[PDB]
Amino acid sequence: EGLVEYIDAEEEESILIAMQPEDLEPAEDVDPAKRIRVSHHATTFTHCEIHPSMILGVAASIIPFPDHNQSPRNTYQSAMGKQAMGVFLTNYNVRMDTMANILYYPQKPLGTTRAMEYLKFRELPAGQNAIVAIACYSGY
Amino acid sequence: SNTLFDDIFQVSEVDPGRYNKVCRIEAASTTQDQCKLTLDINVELFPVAAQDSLTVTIASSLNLEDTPATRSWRPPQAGDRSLADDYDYVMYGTAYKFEEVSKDLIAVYYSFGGLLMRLEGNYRNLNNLKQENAYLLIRR
Amino acid sequence: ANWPLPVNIRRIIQNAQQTFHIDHTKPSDLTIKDIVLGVKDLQENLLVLRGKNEIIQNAQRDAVTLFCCLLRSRLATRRVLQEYRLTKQAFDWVLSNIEAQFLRSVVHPGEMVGVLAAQSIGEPATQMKVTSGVPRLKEILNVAKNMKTPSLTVY
Amino acid sequence: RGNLMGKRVDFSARTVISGDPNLELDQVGVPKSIAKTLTYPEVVTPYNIDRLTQLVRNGPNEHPGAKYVIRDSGDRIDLRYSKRAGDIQLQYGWKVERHIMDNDPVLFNRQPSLHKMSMMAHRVKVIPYSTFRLNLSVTSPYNADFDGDEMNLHVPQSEETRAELSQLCAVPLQIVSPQSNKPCMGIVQDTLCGIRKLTLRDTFIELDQVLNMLYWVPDWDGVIPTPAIIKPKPLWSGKQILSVAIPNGIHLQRFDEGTTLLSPKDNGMLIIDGQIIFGVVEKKTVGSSNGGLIHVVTREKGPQVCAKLFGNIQKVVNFWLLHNGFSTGIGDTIADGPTMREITETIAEAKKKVLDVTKEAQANLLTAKHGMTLRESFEDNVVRFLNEARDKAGRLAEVNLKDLNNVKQMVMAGSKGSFINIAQMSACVGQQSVEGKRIAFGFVDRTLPHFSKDDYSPESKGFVENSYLRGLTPQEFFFHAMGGREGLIDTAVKTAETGYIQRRLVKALEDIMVHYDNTTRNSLGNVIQFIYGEDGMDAAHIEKQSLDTIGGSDAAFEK
Amino acid sequence: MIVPVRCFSCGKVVGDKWESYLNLLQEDELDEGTALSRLGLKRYCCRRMILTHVDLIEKFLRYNPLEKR
Amino acid sequence: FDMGGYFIINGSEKVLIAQERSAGNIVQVFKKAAPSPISHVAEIRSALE
Amino acid sequence: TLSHLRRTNTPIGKLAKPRQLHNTHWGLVCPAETPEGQACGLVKNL
Amino acid sequence: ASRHGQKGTIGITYRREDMPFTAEGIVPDLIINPHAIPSRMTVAHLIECLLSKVAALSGNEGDASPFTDITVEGISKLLREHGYQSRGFEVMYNGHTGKKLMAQIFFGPTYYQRLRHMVDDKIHARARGPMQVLTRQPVEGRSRDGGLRFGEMERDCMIAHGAASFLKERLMEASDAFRVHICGICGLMTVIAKLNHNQFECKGCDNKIDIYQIHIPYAAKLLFQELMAMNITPRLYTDRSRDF
Amino acid sequence: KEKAIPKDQRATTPYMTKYERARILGTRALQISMNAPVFVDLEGETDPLRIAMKELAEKKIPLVIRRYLPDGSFEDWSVEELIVDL
Amino acid sequence: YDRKVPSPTGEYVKEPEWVLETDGVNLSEVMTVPGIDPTRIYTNSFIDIMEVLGIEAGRAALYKEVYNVIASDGSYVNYRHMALLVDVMTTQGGLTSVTRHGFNRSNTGALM
Amino acid sequence: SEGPQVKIREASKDNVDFILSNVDLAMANSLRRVMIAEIPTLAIDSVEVETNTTVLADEFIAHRLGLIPLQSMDIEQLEYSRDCFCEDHCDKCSVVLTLQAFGESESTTNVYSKDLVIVSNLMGRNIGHPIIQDKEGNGVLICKLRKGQELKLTCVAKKGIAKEHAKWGPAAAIEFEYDPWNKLKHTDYWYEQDSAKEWPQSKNCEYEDPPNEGDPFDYKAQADTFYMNVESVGSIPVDQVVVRGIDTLQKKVASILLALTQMDQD
Amino acid sequence: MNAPDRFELFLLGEGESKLKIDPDTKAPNAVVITFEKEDHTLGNLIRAELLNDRKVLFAAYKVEHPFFARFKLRIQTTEGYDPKDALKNACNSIINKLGALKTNFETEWNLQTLA
Ligand SMILES: [Mg+2]
Ligand SMILES: [Zn+2]
Ligand SMILES: [Zn+2]
Ligand SMILES: [Zn+2]
């Protein structure tokens, strides 16, 4: 229907893309807590991003609020997210693998991500929701 | 034992500073025009306001009769009599410096467990203050 | 004026004052002759080399040149009598400690200073207009005829 | 290199390391299973004939126990399979290979082991669980954390090596490093933050808590100090209790900026006869700094006394912080409304300044700075304005922080963080730089496919106006990610290149030694220096001192 | 894989409320927040125990038994 | 939930990692360093699929 | 498993810096998912 | 580890009656140091805990997608509607004494992950064990009761410490140690020693009374033998020929 | 013996070094562990290293340190005459 | 630049002076130019210092270059550690590299 | 009788809310520690598996079975297996339960704790029966079975304390608070603008008068009048948790006195 | 695996005594009592009760290592007062106070209706 279009890296050199349709597309008090967003005051947009969060990969889509983190920390999580015990498959009882780890009681995160719906993380989670306290209790 | 220094001071000002329990008070003697006192007081246990008159006394020992880590401190017992009974605020500290301000003015620095006191006066009124431990007694 | 030197004289003086409870008001019993001769002969006991020939003796004298300058400046006649109020007993105590402390600071024969020096220079390197950091350190260690950014400073 | 210079060795153990604030500086916690595997051959003498016999009876499956018995003829008897004939009768000169016990000196190491303080000798302390345990204060010399790091342990097998290890490689002997003639071990993390909080003038401790804190110091003299406040309630100041851990006779004086005898900000330091007179205790005093408390103690009272100081301070400080508490949360990174308004205006002013210069360059009315191109001069001006904008914005946020703010508390004590961390978390991340320059035009005359060509505004070339609290916009997120990738690449490349440099340096100077004539010579006997260091002193005993004669005016010198 | 018997933090028994929780969501037309409170789970330590549980047992039960009697 | 995308070779699941290469049939001009008689070079890796 | 099925590899004489996160990578490969070791930057994730 | 680069090992485990508790009786399942937050600036970790706390109290699934309109202040307002401190701080009590902690503890749920690295898969020690066929040194690998590498860098540190005797013990007694017989004329390890008969002979030199025994690492013997097969003659001698 | 410097002109440091002390204690401790005659009164002690330390303190160790020079010459110093100042 | 020179009174005071910084090195020819102070000219490359002023001058220049790199990041290392490295680098009457073409080409035993 | 005072605000079969007045903080804290960690209880400790064709591991089911709360009203009449003169176990120190479930139906069949059958001689005691605390009458969902799957195992229950393992813990979260008005200054309230407006008032604030708003700090006051809310897991009545918590603490103190007396003789 | 058996927390081992009383040489009339298989539950309670006695000059306890279930109690009394007697009085006071609490709770509970 001509509503979406595949664009490669080479073709991006000759188009103008909008971050989101909420503000950049419409012709153009402010909350003090919201991040400072630049309108860019452009009236020649040719494409609009589906969602800026989609620039991330599979491993980086599990981090909650990755834009509130220092960039190197996100990289570490991506590598560590691949070493976390979980449920790799539902047929672990019929597969004879060299090594396999299964969590007793996997739980889905309390703070999730929209992209996390399409990774089946709510169906095959790797981790648990633990009550965490940040304190210097005993020096251990 | 015996009083080494006694006088009545009028609190010129009180400064809480960055602390919430300790205030540094500037006071001057009402009888001597060359005597001043800088003292840190725990206002949580002994509140002090401006224009207040304080009786300041310094003694080498608290026992009434003269007896000129010495001994292990023990909790006071019933029927114990000492100079502290006649005053409201009592502190114990050490003198760590004797500074000459002018020909006849001498300043003695006292530290009561981190609460510093500076006693400035003429040579003929602070001659009994030695570089040793002493008690500071304050009565409203 | 701030440079690394073996013996911390300031701490030794403070210890003598606090150990003997110097009066600071009563006049001292030290004599000008004792102080000048006490400091002078102390400099003779600061032995790093113990050869009994001219060449080694000259080397020994040169080795303690800077330390003696510090020693003389701190233990000056006016400073000792006026600033420190030292007593004869206190002065003798200070001299003995300085001799003992200096002899304890001498390098011990058999110490592998070469490995220690290399590790002391290499360990900081791991944590590292002109070239700086590892590329410059590599440029220095490897004697390269052509460096990245040669420069001249002209006064 | 693979079989002669370095080779695999027996009588060693490896496992994960953990932190134990209840262990002495030189003590190391050894898992029970490891202790049951490693053995030390002890010779049978009249002094231990009875003790060793019990170990043989205990067998190899009960710690403390024994695994082998070696006769004077060299024959080895395995304890297993030997009980059927009964316990063996020991004779003088035999060797009993018994499990490593408490206080046994062992060599504890962590690779890459780039310097001599990364390999030190500890005293064994057999413990439950499957992890090594070591004091926190000795983590900095090892450059080790407890995120999963492993360390190697070696057990000497002879009395000569046993004595050599404990008299040269002992942890207390390594407190004062010779690399920079300053201590390499100091109070860190919880104990550094707790000691700063404990020494504040507002910290008063009641009788019930004081008695517990006093008793926690092993070398306590059994005398309760007189409270700072006698009436109307007996209260002990935090400085008074901490002074108990400091050995008597230690004097230390330091003056910071604005510090006087009557310290108004309670800064500086003054200790007389082991009692803290005034001043807060922070990294400048109890840390691994030149002229600090550790340096003074280890040089005046010896290394063994200094080692006890580490435990005493940690034990008293950790106990107080356990019952006091210390945390940090999102509320510590939030600045009040007025500060945020000032921060937003400050960044806007910098942007307007950048706007003005970007307009003069477009008009060609800007003269290039000498020695630089017009474009290079313009970039330097833009970078300088933006860099100063972040610094000014961070200053406003830091000033607004209260004394109760936990992040501020950590920064002041020196335990963790710094000014930049506060600014980026609360005020502004700032300009992202790649290759020491702003974000380059990866595309044709633009950075991302969202700005028009020839856009030089801060938002276009990688200026993150938001903070981590507010969140990064997608453009800022990518530019920030680009900057971080530079750091990760450098870390990998730097590690490899620096490792080769260190090996080359060590091999070039490995044969240089100080001889009994005080000359520095190599294996050939060639003289490198006629006296070590040109003065003949040891770097571990050097201290920074002021020369009073060089400085000052002539009149001052005469006076 | 199956509902835990006890709350991890405080040890409250939560393994006998899984079916009730599902029934409330389906038949009672209640949001998850109201259903948790009606079951007596007040501390948020208990709420996350039932709220974030994933029932992987149902997926495993789809496979035919390895050994049938 | 299995998505395939791999091969089973000798009972082992093997995944073919995509390999990154430079595109062919494109003119690319590069600059050489001073120690070389050639200043600029235009190279095309002619490829027929 | 999902990440491993979407990985790409770059074989490293060349005159360039391929380990950097180029601008053209926006929206095509994850800007944060990369190995921390010798393969940093060379192994990318779609 | 968490989902924000924060990884760590369990320092110690405490029972419920020892852990700190809130006024509601909730004890943490985990305690992490505050010092990990500032230097790493993982602000998302703190926001997630605040969001997760609100989600559990409201029985909802938190929305933590990167680029949305969700702000920290908005989470705080909802948390305050539930009767909790807006910033997530709570008053806690020391488990040992029951007294209130002077400071308030950031307290809330967070999603943690268990990584593959378990200590029981890493702990291993070796007093003695199998040796390699070629070099006659401790084998490699935890699964094969192998030893630990005392590499050149480790040797360098020991040289700096001056522990010459300990260095020899590691390299000789704790590793390959071999005794070989050398000829006094030729420094080659070609002396046939019949120890049972107490007879020695060096064919090629025609001597039986000029034999010496030396202790060298088996790897060193292999090196010299490899050199000998390479036409190089590494000759070992017991007496000096030139003055220092 | 031209390589033995007479006692009258020894030019080495008269203070026992840390390395010399470490080997002397270790060497004497090893001998004690192998049933060597103890020349110091024992007030109760079983560790050979501790016994060696007691002997060194009282200067009852019958050993001499042969300090070598980079040319092959050496000086013999008795443990008793070496001052233990470190 | 700011340099501390003794004042006529006797104190040390900071006075400003004009210093020329150059890209490229020609020490021999520049040193003879009139108007400059030949007793203070310094060169980044210690190689040209050794060729013009000698090994001892190169020794001091080499140490200064090493010291600057160490002190660039604010880290402090004891003087003798750097001095020993510099002395070894200049002991053989010339600047010997720390590679296999330098110290490894000496005569210290094949096994080493 | 004129010692610690007790005032119950809300009493139920699962929660008891009371005010503990005229008591010391050390005693109040020790009481809750004993209530959580040192009250004996009955729980399954060993499980023998005869047949297991389920989709769960044998240890997985064993762990779940051990967390099932069992009646422990007459636990005091039972003996510790370590203190009993029996080979493995007997009726004097153990209770045996049997679980047998088969997938006779086509749909998924659930195995609850009500299916556990006691096969030991209770000897007139009141222990062993699994606690049922729901409307439907079922217990904890131990496992699920499909057609053709069978579970057969035998459970042995022994008495123990939570210090050995949390499964013998008879008490859930225990609320504990004192001085809701912070009149003792035991906490330094973190705040941004005003601590009073930012910190919600505890529900116990209505039982104590607010500060006089300007009066001097009372330095002679000691903490008292503790507000506690004890929850029970169902193994024993909530009131018995408090009553036996006091009894356990009293016995521990008495043991110290007894041990001290024994040393006196020698 | 090196996890100690959980019963070592409370069960007393063979050849081990509940109490180990040794005189303290650091101060006169001071003793140190080592409690085995005990934790803060008793140490805190006993120490708090001792501090209420006017004849006790010092009373503190510590747990040297959380791995092991044992704590030390140091008591110093005035001359003529035996520290062992001080412990006797403290324990008796705790027993009497606890007994009063138990009776008070039971009578109050019997007055409720819902349970
Ligand atoms: Mg690490
Ligand atoms: Zn719960
Ligand atoms: Zn031969
Ligand atoms: Zn029985």
From Swiss-Prot, chain B:
Matches recorded under SUPFAM superfamilies: Nucleic acid-binding proteins
One GO cellular component term: nucleoplasm
Localization per Swiss-Prot or TrEMBL: Nucleus
Phosphothreonine modification, residue list: T67
UniProt keyword annotation of Iron present: no
Region described as Non-specific ssDNA binding: 15-38
Keywords assigned by UniProt, alphabetized: Acetylation, DNA-binding, DNA-directed RNA polymerase, Nucleus, Phosphoprotein, Ribosome biogenesis, Transcription
GO biological process: nucleolar large rRNA transcription by RNA polymerase I; ribosome biogenesis; RNA-templated transcription; termination of RNA polymerase I transcription; termination of RNA polymerase III transcription; transcription by RNA polymerase I; transcription by RNA polymerase II; transcription by RNA polymerase III
Gene3D superfamilies xrefs: Nucleic acid-binding proteins
Keyword check for Transmembrane: no
Example of a GO MF term: DNA binding
Modified sites of kind N-acetylserine: S1
Oligomeric form and interacting partners: Component of the RNA polymerase I (Pol I), RNA polymerase II (Pol II) and RNA polymerase III (Pol III) complexes. Component of the RNA polymerase I (Pol I) complex consisting of 14 subunits: RPA135, RPA190, RPC40, RPA14, RPB5, RPO26, RPA43, RPB8, RPA12, RPB10, RPC19, RPC10, RPA49 and RPA34. The complex is composed of a horseshoe-shaped core containing ten subunits (RPA135, RPA190, RPB5, RPO26, RPB8, RPB10, RPC10, RPA12, RPC19 and RPC40) where RPA135 and RPA190 form the DNA-binding cleft.
Assigned protein family: Belongs to the eukaryotic RPB8 RNA polymerase subunit family.
Misc. remarks from the entry: Present with 6210 molecules/cell in log phase SD medium.
Name of protein: DNA-directed RNA polymerases I, II, and III subunit RPABC3
From Swiss-Prot, chain D:
Region forming the signal peptide: none
Cell compartments where the protein resides: Nucleus
Post-translational modification: The tandem 7 residues repeats in the C-terminal domain (CTD) can be highly phosphorylated. The phosphorylation activates Pol II. Phosphorylation occurs mainly at residues 'Ser-2' and 'Ser-5' of the heptapeptide repeat. The phosphorylated form of Pol II appears to carry, on average, one phosphate per repeat. The phosphorylation state is believed to result from the balanced action of site-specific CTD kinases and phosphatases, and a 'CTD code' that specifies the position of Pol II within the transcription cycle has been proposed.
Chain residues that bind Mg(2+) 2: D145, D147
Region (Bridging helix): 474-486
Residues reported in the UniProt entry to bind Mg(2+) 1: D145, D147, D149
Domain of life (superkingdom): Eukaryota
Glycyl lysine isopeptide (Lys-Gly) (interchain with G-Cter in ubiquitin) cross-link, chain position(s): K359
Subunit structure: Component of the RNA polymerase II (Pol II) complex consisting of 12 subunits. Interacts with DEF1; the interaction is direct and serves to bridge RPB1 to the Elongin complex in a DNA-damaged dependent manner. Interacts with the Elongin subunit ELA1. Interacts with the Elongin subunit ELC1. Interacts with ASK10. Interacts with ESS1. Interacts with RTT103. Interacts with SHE2.
Domain notes: The C-terminal domain (CTD) serves as a platform for assembly of factors that regulate transcription initiation, elongation, termination and mRNA processing.
Family: Belongs to the RNA polymerase beta' chain family.
Name used for this protein in its record: DNA-directed RNA polymerase II subunit RPB1
Whole-protein residues included: 337 to 895 of 1733
Curated annotation (Swiss-Prot), chain F:
Subcellular location: Nucleus
Function description: DNA-dependent RNA polymerase catalyzes the transcription of DNA into RNA using the four ribonucleoside triphosphates as substrates. Second largest component of RNA polymerases II which synthesizes mRNA precursors and many functional non-coding RNAs. Proposed to contribute to the polymerase catalytic activity and forms the polymerase active center together with the largest subunit. Pol II is the central component of the basal RNA polymerase II transcription machinery.
Signal peptide: none
Range covered out of full length: 197 to 245 of 1224
Assembly and oligomerization: Component of the RNA polymerase II (Pol II) complex consisting of 12 subunits.
Origin superkingdom: Eukaryota
Listed name of the protein: DNA-directed RNA polymerase II subunit RPB2
Additional record remark: The binding of ribonucleoside triphosphate to the RNA polymerase II transcribing complex probably involves a two-step mechanism. The initial binding seems to occur at the entry (E) site and involves a magnesium ion coordinated by three conserved aspartate residues of the two largest RNA Pol II subunits. Present with 18700 molecules/cell in log phase SD medium.
Family label: Belongs to the RNA polymerase beta chain family.
Swiss-Prot record, chain L:
Gene Ontology biological-process annotations: RNA-templated transcription; termination of RNA polymerase II transcription; transcription by RNA polymerase II; transcription elongation by RNA polymerase II; transcription initiation at RNA polymerase II promoter
SUPFAM superfamilies found in the cross-reference section: RBP11-like subunits of RNA polymerase
Pfam families for the chain: RNA_pol_L_2 (PF13656)
Cellular localization per UniProt: Nucleus
Single annotated GO MF: DNA binding
GO cellular component terms listed in the entry, alphabetical order: nucleus; RNA polymerase II, core complex
Reported effect, L111P: Transcript termination readthrough
The keyword Nucleus belongs to this UniProt entry's keyword annotation: yes
Domain of life: Eukaryota
Keywords: DNA-directed RNA polymerase, Nucleus, Transcription
InterPro entries given in the database record: RBP11 (IPR037685), RBP11-like (IPR036603), RBP11-like_dimer (IPR009025), RNA_pol_Rpb11_13-16kDa_CS (IPR008193), Rpo11-like (IPR022905)
Other remarks in the entry: Present with 4280 molecules/cell in log phase SD medium.
HAMAP family assigned to the protein according to its UniProt record, in alphabetical order: RNApol_arch_Rpo11
Annotated function: DNA-dependent RNA polymerase catalyzes the transcription of DNA into RNA using the four ribonucleoside triphosphates as substrates. Component of RNA polymerase II which synthesizes mRNA precursors and many functional non-coding RNAs. Pol II is the central component of the basal RNA polymerase II transcription machinery. It is composed of mobile elements that move relative to each other. RPB11 is part of the core element with the central large cleft. Seems to be involved transcript termination.
Family label: Belongs to the archaeal Rpo11/eukaryotic RPB11/RPC19 RNA polymerase subunit family.
